[PDB]
Amino acid sequence: DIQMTQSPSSLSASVGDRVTITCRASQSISSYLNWYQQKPGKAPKLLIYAASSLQSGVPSRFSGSGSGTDFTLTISSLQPEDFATYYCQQSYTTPLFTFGPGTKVDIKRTVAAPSVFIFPPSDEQLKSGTASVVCLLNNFYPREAKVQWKVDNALQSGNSQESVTEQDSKDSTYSLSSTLTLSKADYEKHKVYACEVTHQGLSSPVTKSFNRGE
Amino acid sequence: EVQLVESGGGLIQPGGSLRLSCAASGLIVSSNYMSWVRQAPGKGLEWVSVLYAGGSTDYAGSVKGRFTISRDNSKNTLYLQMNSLRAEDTAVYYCARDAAVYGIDVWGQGTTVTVSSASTKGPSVFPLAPSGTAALGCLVKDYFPEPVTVSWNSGALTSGVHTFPAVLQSSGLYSLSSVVTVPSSSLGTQTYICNVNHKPSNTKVDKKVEPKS
Amino acid sequence: NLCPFGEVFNATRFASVYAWNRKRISNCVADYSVLYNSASFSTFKCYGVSPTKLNDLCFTNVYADSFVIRGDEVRQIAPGQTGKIADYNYKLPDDFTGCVIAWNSNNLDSKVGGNYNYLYRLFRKSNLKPFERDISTEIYQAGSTPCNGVKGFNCYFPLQSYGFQPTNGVGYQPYRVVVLSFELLHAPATVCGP
Ligand SMILES: *[C@@H]1O[C@H](CO)[C@@H](O)[C@H](O)[C@H]1NC(C)=O
């Protein structure tokens, strides 16, 4: 079989640039390669078929090249509606096609560190017998950021979930929440609840925390 | 015109079954490689099964012996019969016409299939209290099924608001938070209320959020 | 005289699976164990017949069909199989009585950067009947409006090229295939073993 890899994963670019996405097959698949655009909530649009052929009605700025193992989707002048996710798919084993993982093209912006905020469980939710501790990283660019939970300076692993907003309409920033979920019984038994954020716009990791009586 | 028009997904318990429907117009599904493709939340495109113009079929390892692709050429419709459904199959299902070397050029709009044994349940709204600029918000916890809508002060508060997407917990229940940043000077003087609506359970909640001590 | 199995097996060029070749063997003697007694072959399954009990048997006609496909496609040269090859290229009857022989030919049939000589039919409207042979090059009509000889939306050229690259894994390499079919009619049987 043929697995597919995509190079950038996430790529930052501005209106008018020449953006280049890469794709690669575990085998030599000739020109049996197709490119797709996808936006949140909609279906894939076929952009390039047979590695170079521009599809009916797709703007001329979409060039496609490559053959064999490595391929390239090129956009000659990135447009405002071009910000999306681009996949490659292989036809060699048609009709059992495998797709790539994707490259997301977001809107480039000056680097912007997160504003970090920590929220202890409400006294109201503690009656229900479970505790939710929230960490917010607000208005950050670029999308890549790392949140570590420490409870009493011991790092937590399988107890947190994250969520991120689509890129702001006007910030072009991202926000991220992380929720650490314990039982009241557990939460009772520890003092320092801390949230440590590493990001490219922070010189060292920022830690915001609280103690249980405060 | 050229279009695939899908229908037929929704809620179903594990072990139940559904029947997806791809109404073709602008191509003949009996003259085509017609595939079903699914996309798990945030996870990209995975092929599920094929209908060869000649009538042979293939399936993905996972669905093999639980799903059944079929067609009815009088109605020009592709069909997917999903039996013995499991929570993993939870995704959006597209139908497409695979033109192979020429690409997958025609996709249906997608229909969403949620497999869950969860009872439908309205959220609890807990306050995320304030402690320059201050941040506050609402934990919209333990609801099902999607979706939920959050606004602040009934529409009078929009700047600096972020309503994150839901996560799905190991309970089969969704939860999300909505936050907003406001001047810390308004903290003792400006009323901040979050308005949570969840139609599947006919639940509306408001919650004043204020500092504690 | 001996049967021309040499001309079929050792032929300098093999056909594209879609226009598979058929050599009919008649009035001759054949040693079918000097075939099976070669380790040269990667598949040598016989259905309806035993490969040893072959020099003990006469037939009225033997048929040597040959073509090239991909190694992952050799599974479909078997009774009861589906996929681009079996459905649109070369089908064997459910009651097949014969032998399918195949050997890897990466050294002879893949050129650096692609051998675009060998082709397979990618588009058809209906599966082939057994031992049927479709040589049409007409534009394939996937729509309801006709195509009139031009590639375009819903109008597909029906033959494509296996891009044989010699570096690929063994699954996507060329394999040469000879299908030996043994028929018994009510007429003087002329193809005997010794
Ligand atoms: C093909 O050639 C080799 C010698 O180069 C020979 O041993 C073999 O028998 C030949 N095949 C047939 C069918 O005679």
- Name which of A27, A101, A102 is nearest A70 in CA terms: A27
Is A64 in CB contact (< 8 Å) with chain B? no
Interacting residues of B100 by C-beta distance below 8 A, sequence separation 6+: A91, A94, A95, B33, C122, C123, C160
Residue A136: strand pairing partners = A117, A177
Pick A32's closest partner by Cβ from C113, C153, C163. Answer: C163
State phi, psi for B164 to the nearest 5 degrees: -70, 160
Pick A46's closest partner by Cβ from B46, B104, B124. Answer: B104
Is B156 in CB contact (< 8 Å) with chain C? no
d(CA C118, CA B5) in angstroms, rounded, equals 38
DSSP state of A61: T
Find chain B residues with C-beta within 8 A of C126's C-beta: 53-54
Ligand 1 atom closest to C8 (CA) = 13
Specify burial of residue B94 (Cβ count, 10 A radius: 0-12, 13-18, 19+): buried
Ligand 1 atom closest to C9 (CA) = 13
- Listing DSSP states for A127-195 in one string gives HTTEEEEEEEEEEEBSS-EEEEEEETTEE--TTEEEEEPPPPTTT--EEEEEEEEEEHHHHHT--EEEE
CA of B148 vs chain A CAs: smallest distance (Å): 15
Does C143 sit within 8 Å of B28, measured CB to CB? yes
Smallest CA–CA distance from C116 into chain A, residue: A30
d(CA B207, CA A96) in angstroms, rounded, equals 51
C10 in contact with ligand 1, CB cutoff 6 A: yes
Beta pairing class for A10-13 and A103-107: parallel
Q: How many CA atoms lie within 13 A of C47 on its CB side?
A: 15
Q: Which domains does chain A have, with CATH numbers?
A: 4-107 (2.60.40.10), 115-211 (2.60.40.10)
CA of A80 vs chain C CAs: smallest distance (Å): 28
Q: Which amino acid does the sequence have at A161?
A: Q
Structural contact between residues B153 and B193, judged by C-beta atoms closer than 8 angstroms: yes
* All structural domains of chain C with their residue ranges: 5-121+163-192
CA of A17 vs chain B CAs: smallest distance (Å): 26
Alpha carbon of C3 to ligand 1 centroid (Å): 13
Specify burial of residue B137 (Cβ count, 10 A radius: 0-12, 13-18, 19+): buried
d(CA B153, CA C141) in angstroms, rounded, equals 59
* All structural domains of chain B with their residue ranges: 3-115, 124-209
d(CA C114, CA C163) in angstroms, rounded, equals 5
Which protein residue's CA is at the shortest distance from atom 2 of ligand 1?
C10
User: To 10 degrees, the CA torsion angle through B25, B30, B33, B36?
Assistant: 60
B3-115 and B124-209: identical CATH topology: yes
d(CA A124, CA A104) in angstroms, rounded, equals 40
d(CA C70, CA C164) in angstroms, rounded, equals 9
Q: Which amino acid does the sequence have at C38?
A: S
Q: Look at the domain B124-209 and name its fold.
A: Immunoglobulin-like (2.60.40)
d(CA B18, CA B12) in angstroms, rounded, equals 8
Which architecture does CATH list for B3-115?
Sandwich (2.60)
Locate C49 and state its tokens: 């017949």
Size of interface A-C (CB pairs under 8 A): 23
Most ligand 1 atoms within 8 A of CB, residue of C1, C5, C7, C9 to mutate = C9
d(CA B21, CA B9) in angstroms, rounded, equals 9
d(CA A174, CA B47) in angstroms, rounded, equals 31
Interacting residues of C164 by C-beta distance below 8 A, sequence separation 6+: C106, C109, C110, C111, C114, C115, C118, C173, C174
Mutate to test the interface with C, among A1, A27, A28 (most CBs of C within 10 A): A28
Smallest CA–CA distance from A1 into chain C, residue: C171
d(CA B98, CA B79) in angstroms, rounded, equals 15
Structural contact between residues C178 and C90, judged by C-beta atoms closer than 8 angstroms: no
Find chain B residues with C-beta within 8 A of A87's C-beta: 44-45
Give the Å distances, CA to CA, from A86 to A10, A43, A165, B44, B131. Answer: 10, 12, 19, 11, 42
For tokens 């810390």, the residue is B184
Does C160 sit within 8 Å of B100, measured CB to CB? yes
Structural contact between residues A159 and A210, judged by C-beta atoms closer than 8 angstroms: no
Dihedral over Cα of A211, A129, A137, A178: its sign: positive
Most ligand 1 atoms within 8 A of CB, residue of C1, C3, C7, C10 to mutate = C10
C18 in contact with ligand 1, CB cutoff 6 A: no
Provide the edge-to-edge strand list for the sheet that holds A192-199. Answer: A154-155, A145-151, A192-199, A206-211
Q: Look at the domain C5-121+163-192 and name its fold.
A: Alpha-Beta Plaits (3.30.70)
Structural contact between residues B19 and B33, judged by C-beta atoms closer than 8 angstroms: no
Alpha carbon of C138 to ligand 1 centroid (Å): 39
Does B105 sit within 8 Å of A46, measured CB to CB? yes
Contacts of residues B168-174 at CB distance under 8 Å and 24 or more positions apart, as own/partner, are: B168/B41, B169/A161, B169/A181, B169/B142, B171/B118, B171/B142, B172/B87, B172/B116, B172/B117, B172/B118, B172/B144, B173/B118, B173/B121, B173/B142, B173/B143, B173/B144, B174/B142, B174/B143, B174/B144, B174/B145, B174/B146, B174/B148
